[model samples]
Target: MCNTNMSVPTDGAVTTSQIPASEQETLVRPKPLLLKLLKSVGAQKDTYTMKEVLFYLGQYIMTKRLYDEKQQHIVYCSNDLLGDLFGVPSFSVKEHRKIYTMIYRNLVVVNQQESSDSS
Candidate 1:
């Protein structure tokens, strides 16, 4: 999920200002194919639960639900691999690859990191 950055007002107080929509943080090498695939899955009439994505993507990975709602899974890709897929210069929170590359590489690492976590 995207986040909005807030700051203190000029007088050193917090104030609500009309913040501009932040530019989409995309990777340098966008994976249109993968993005489209995910979009299609999401479009499939409520079949797009995080569980499904996890299992499908998990084929290339070993996944763990690190946070609430199973949204953030811990897959083992270095930030670099993710950046390539997302087509972002670099990820803000993390990762730079579009969705496809990020997902695939994450799976690869998931397998690599699986032993670490499983043990």
Candidate 2:
């Protein structure tokens, strides 16, 4: 004689579909100079997220191989575009926070309500 036992489990019913409204509206327009730089990198969007801009800049730096030989933490702005952006010929990697802040200063937040406002 044998006994059979069967049990069914039903405890996996969790769904996450809500996203933050602010994230959807966080867009920025770059200044004229920054716009030119971005255009050179082939990012032709009217508005961009901060991450997008940084990603492009990062790619540009990687392609240019701007890091110092001895002091690897230092980055040289060997090109006209990068020099104009940072307003210097070179910068330390430690200044990354300030570099990001400088980039942000050159961008204007895209206000959804004032989308019609032209500059």
Candidate 3:
């Protein structure tokens, strides 16, 4: 019994140190409109990391072969879902960073405590 108590404190200290490293990765939830579009890309999660969303969206575009033949760097919005999501017919793949920014508008960070008081 005395030995068991000695080990518990040691284990507790190690666990406490580990938590801070993991805290940096925050989870986020997509808005209703984006969530619907994400479904077509096979993302069924209510919350995800931004990287996960980008990966899934990229995978969907590649799998559907949405890139233009003449200009491979450009992605053709061949379907209604794609068309509606970006509000454009096509865009350069180089603009993915900008695309993420656009998508960010529809994401809310999970577990974030926002001050809603309008003073």
Candidate 4:
């Protein structure tokens, strides 16, 4: 069950064929949370845009207990909110503090509630 003499493959020497298909890095599908946020905000026609995201984010900010030790919170300013969500640094130390970060980083939103057969 074990090949003791086998050596690890070199970086360039590893080919796609050698690797299992399931382990290959494919286009990651959007998660359920992303779409829920999009639709809960008023995303019509199943798909939403960044503009709506900002508006939704604006609303989300008001509902959260988000704050820093200095009583600071993330606020959108100018058009840089987009950058803040995807780039820059975040003060949140909570686990998955990058939820919004990854949402923008991935930038792939899919409505999880829509039936594939919906007309």
Candidate 5:
């Protein structure tokens, strides 16, 4: 999800034009990576639903380059892992990667924030 900015019509009485960018109220979207990271952990509490856990597992596989024989770039996950991870028994590899990327990106955003905030 990306940030949504409000716009004022030309005839509107007030608008972003009337306010300084620094002071304007903007909807800050959670970076996809952060969202994915949050989603990976269920975003509710310590407990994660089975589906959520699978998504994180998929992410971990890609992150660690879990594959057969280095230099081949062929990632490996058991069929059960894929079925359970996807929930619908099967989905496209593109979809699988999409979910993985979201989790990875969300995790990256969170790590960055933690690092910046800690210091």
Candidate 6:
């Protein structure tokens, strides 16, 4: 009841000391989405470079949403995508748009499969 969207915390603050050790909130670990992403980007082993990930992120994400609408997207981004998002002579709006569309399609497929499985 405490952890779900049905009962959202109105105030962001919560006292931890009164909570039991077993009841302490924790974020669930992700299911290696990075590993999946690395494969999608052609990264092998444990050697996924920042450049590749940044390129993927920049192309797929509406990074320009981080700040004002008119502002450039690259300035506030982290890691190598900074250049990937903003760097000209090599801007990849087309590639990014393509990846974003693909990602949305894949997410729909995965979500539907999971829903059916749970049902």
User: Candidate 1 on 1-119: residue-level lDDT in tens?
Assistant: 23336755566467432211113222222234333433433323322333344333333223222112333443334543233344443232222134433444543211122456656
Tens-digit per-residue lDDT, 31-109, candidate 2: 6666566667787877776566665665555446776676555668766576666766776644555665665554467
lDDT of 5 by residue, 14-107 (tens): 5433221123322223333333433444354433332443445445444534344553234554543333333332233334445443333322
| Residue 44, candidate 3: alpha-carbon lDDT | 80
Q: RMSD (Cα, Å) of candidate 4?
A: 14.5
Candidate 6 per-residue lDDT, tens place, 38-84, comes to: 44445455433334444444433344243223433322334333233
lDDT of 4 at 114: 60
Task: Give the residue spans of candidate 3 off by over 4 A.
Answer: 1-26, 114-119
Tell me the whole-model lDDT of each prediction, alpha carbons only: 0.34, 0.58, 0.58, 0.41, 0.38, 0.36
Which is the leading candidate under TM-score?
A: 2
lDDT of 3: 0.58
Deviation in Å, model 4, residue 65 alpha carbon = 3.2
lDDT of 4 at 4: 30
Question: What is residue 1's positional error in candidate 5, in angstroms?
Answer: 21
Ranking by TM-score: 2, 3, 4, 5, 6, 1
By the lDDT metric, which is better: model 3 or model 6? 3
Q: Give the poorly placed runs of model 2, Cα more than 4 Å off.
A: 1-25, 70-72, 93-95, 114-119
Sequence-dependent TM-score of model 4? 0.32
TM-score of 5: 0.22
Per-residue lDDT of 35 in model 1 = 32
- What is the alpha-carbon lDDT of model 1 when measured against the actual structure? 0.34
Worst 10 residues of 4 by lDDT: 16-25
As for candidate 3, its clashing pairs are: none
